[PDB]
From Swiss-Prot:
Residues 16-81, 116-179 form the Ig-like C2-type domain. Expressed by NK cells. Interacts with ARRB2. Interacts with PTPN6; the interaction is enhanced by ARRB2. Interacts with PTPN11; the interaction is enhanced by ARRB2. One of its GO terms (cellular component) is plasma membrane. One of its GO terms (molecular function) is signaling receptor activity. This is Killer cell immunoglobulin-like receptor 2DL1. The gene is KIR2DL1. The chain holds residues 27 to 221 of 348 of the full protein. Belongs to the immunoglobulin superfamily. Disulfide bonds join C23-C74, C123-C172. Glycans are attached at N41, N58, N118, N152.
Amino acid sequence: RKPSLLAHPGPLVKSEETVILQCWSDVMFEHFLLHREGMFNDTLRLIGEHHDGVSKANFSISRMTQDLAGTYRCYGSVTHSPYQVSAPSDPLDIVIIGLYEKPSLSAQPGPTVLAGENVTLSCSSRSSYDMYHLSREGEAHERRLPAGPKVNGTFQADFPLGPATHGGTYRCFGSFHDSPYEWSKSSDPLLVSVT
């Protein structure tokens, strides 16, 4: 069975700041394997610490650098079965943010709608970002879309939210094709409310 993987304080890290990745399972794993897919692929074996019912292991990053950015997954293991590991934790993208000008985030028809209204959030900027990333507070994986051709000055991606059900606070970021885990500064948060 797969462990959990979380970043403290969060997966979106400013350049040279710290982040700690933690693997944990209510299953008493002796060791955890933390695997990163990115510019520098690596798999680290961490010793599981037992904390009253929980087994967990940390991988601490003192200064966030692009070599540590990427998609991470954790596996739990036990020594009586050295050649087998648990199913993988859900992937967690550790990204470096705050590297470029923050984009603009707007909602159509607007940020306050009735349930069912078809809402679209648009991320835009004068910077020539190749991709935009949409983050919703409290929701795990960022959505992404390629920026639309420059419509004379502006580069933008339109994220459909579909018929409104639940509100949320959204933020967005731009990135370049050369580096999928290096993003701009966050747009100002947008609160979408649904009645």
